Amino acid sequence: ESKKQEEGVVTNLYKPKEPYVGRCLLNTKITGDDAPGETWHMVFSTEGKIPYREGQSIGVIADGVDKNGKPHKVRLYSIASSAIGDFGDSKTVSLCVKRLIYTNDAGEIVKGVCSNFLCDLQPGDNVQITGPVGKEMLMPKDPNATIIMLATGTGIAPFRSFLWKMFFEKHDDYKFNGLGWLFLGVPTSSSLLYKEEFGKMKERAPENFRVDYAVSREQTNAAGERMYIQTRMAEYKEELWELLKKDNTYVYMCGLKGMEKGIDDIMVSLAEKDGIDWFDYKKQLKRGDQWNVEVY
Amino acid sequence: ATYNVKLITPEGEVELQVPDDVYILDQAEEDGIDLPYSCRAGSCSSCAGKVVSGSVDQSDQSYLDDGQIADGWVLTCHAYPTSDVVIETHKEEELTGA
């Protein structure tokens, strides 16, 4: 079986062939008007019809069709709201969508289809949803376990869900009493997501929480090395390694794929100096559901 | 209850040994093979892969569309082999009449 929570878990209550039509109740830009790339926190209604759990995710089907008269395929988004939602009624579900925009090798400014359909949603609009999807990023059953959360960009999403249940809420079947460690890597402070919140969490229980930001552009460590999501972990590499060998330490990674290389790099060097080669060790961790990735 | 599977990765060409009641991606993270995965539920195109010599079971479609089951495409994270298989992993599509 699994060390992860799978009691009240469900998947595919809705599929691309017949999605749940929710409605945008809220949609706000949570990045400073001067950040490299806008990210938006948005809230849809579900009427409790989608009992997703911390860690899972929902799919969205943008309106219309692509340059071929065919309905757009489903795009996935990690759920940024805990089970009960940002309203406490288990009636909503929230998303942290980064809006995709780049210029191509022709000088044409392109826009991601779904992420843009999402950031432009006007409260009241219908949004087609699918899921809940995923069981890999679920939370562990052990409420006293350590839990490292490595996140980059909208990759904070599932962890923001995690934390909401770990502190901003009180359940008669769950009481976090271990350590919740978060590492968020972004390029600017105008790009930090939910800092205020992680600020209140760091007080609601400063004994169980520990947050470390990694503003890559406005931060450097030793040799003026840009403070990356993994460069931040470097400064704790010692304490960190002394955890990566206990039955109750569960690591979670999520976000822009690529933030995964560095992490293994600072992990290989650390392990390749004590035990086997990091790689084969990650295999022993994933054995007991202690290293769950979901990069994209 | 243990079929032979071949992975033509843009790296080399694996020669795994995947069983029946076991997803392919899972056996890739076992022998120490590194293949793309995201949701690991079968809802995205992170682990796509055009199949060849053989057949596999991917009933937990979710992202598997119409002519996707015919074109041969496979979601390595959600597919058990029903015969010896030869897939071309890391394969992607983001256009073609789109």
Ligand SMILES: Cc1cc2nc3c(=O)[nH]c(=O)nc-3n(C[C@H](O)[C@H](O)[C@H](O)COP(=O)(O)OP(=O)(O)OC[C@H]3O[C@@H](n4cnc5c(N)ncnc54)[C@H](O)[C@@H]3O)c2cc1C
């Ligand atoms: C499990 C999972 C969870 C996810 N969670 C989130 C989340 O919480 N928040 C979020 O915002 N997204 C998330 N995503 C990503 C999301 O699903 C989409 O991939 C993203 O929003 C872009 O889709 P789109 O429809 O807007 O754009 P699309 O039109 O699909 O465009 C994407 C395509 O644009 C091209 N492209 C992308 N970046 C560049 C670049 N820098 N330069 C040049 N070409 C480029 C590539 O060909 C790419 O395939 C997740 C994905 C998965 C699998």
Ligand code: FES
């Ligand atoms: S890992 Fe997402 S579809 Fe295979």
